[PDB]
Amino acid sequence: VKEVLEDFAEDGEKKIKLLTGKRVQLAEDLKKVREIQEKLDAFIEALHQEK
């Protein structure tokens, strides 16, 4: 089990394929949305360097 779990720990595709519970995917989307908000504001903050 330890050998297999370590293989799964490295096997991202199976982890994605196995972990499809619709809440972690929503949680993953929320993280991406949060990252984009930072990335959106970072560029927008860079636009505001004019004044």
Binding site: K15, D29, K31
Partner: protein, 409 residues
Amino acid sequence: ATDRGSESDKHFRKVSDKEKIDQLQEELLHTQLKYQRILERLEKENKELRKLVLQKDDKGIHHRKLKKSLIDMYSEVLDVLSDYDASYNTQDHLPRVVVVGDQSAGKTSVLEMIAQARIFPRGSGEMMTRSPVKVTLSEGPHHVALFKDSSREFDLTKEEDLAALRHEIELRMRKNVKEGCTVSPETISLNVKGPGLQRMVLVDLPGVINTVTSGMAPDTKETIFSISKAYMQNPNAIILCIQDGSVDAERSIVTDLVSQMDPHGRRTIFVLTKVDLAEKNVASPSRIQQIIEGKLFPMKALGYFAVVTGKGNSSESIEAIREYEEEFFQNSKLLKTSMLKAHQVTTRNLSLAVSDCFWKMVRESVEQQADSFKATRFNLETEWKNNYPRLRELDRNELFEKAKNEILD
């Protein structure tokens, strides 16, 4: 006697510490607890030491508000967006500049003579563009472009390096295409620096084909239309409409693609390519007088209708193309006997004018995205939390590890 495995593994684990605890305690707990903290504080120092050297190449530190990596901020935002959501639900709200025109037109020429003539496969004989190719252009020295966002170290002024770089893009172009078509929406990310490059993102969408010949898979033209939605459904997209110059406007597909996107031309500029083919056939100056006035094109594109011309040889260097373009436009009756002054026609005016319109749209619309994404998160968190009150914060890495421990337990 009831169980012996637990005793053995625990006893050997206790032996491992007695001999090596003086090294394991430092590595296993002390280092790891500090490891995360030093990432924020001490890696900061090493990042800044190199970053400052990189900024000096950018000149951002030397000059206030002027930095070549400043435009790279724009691309970083889109790269996350494409990874987060590559579908129309998000892509349709992302500002961009697209190259739209007949496939025959050689529409990509508007970008080839800037940086891409050296690293992008071109020439006649076959359809070249297979999927949207986005090029991040930035004022700077010659520097090998990023290929699929991958670092490269090549000399952009020597053929041996450029030929290998042309191969790299071609591999992405064809690999993006699957059976049943010849075109794919999967995009290719390029970021190049060099002289004459403007700060903007220009995307060479695959050329539209009126009819799907037997030399192309049946779904080629339908797929291009769907890919054309990158601008047809994008109020933040700027469209460069390319008329194949040798043939007349009523025949061309691009007329309908853009006029259904913005019939007022507010989101587009009309550009003509291969105008010099007017003098390799019986030229019509009166037809060119209708071209500049947009009587010939229904999208009523705004701005000066720039024209791109070239020798037609697929080996002409960027510098050779620029010199050929200036001499031809300043003397050809196509523009000298009509109201198309060469200094407005020249491609370098389009690049500046496109860069001017690029930042106009980006600053105006980008702030709307911040409110949209924030509203999205609140609506998603409200429903997600209500249906899953237990998990206020979850990640697929946290989900796996809990199972990993749970299974072992």
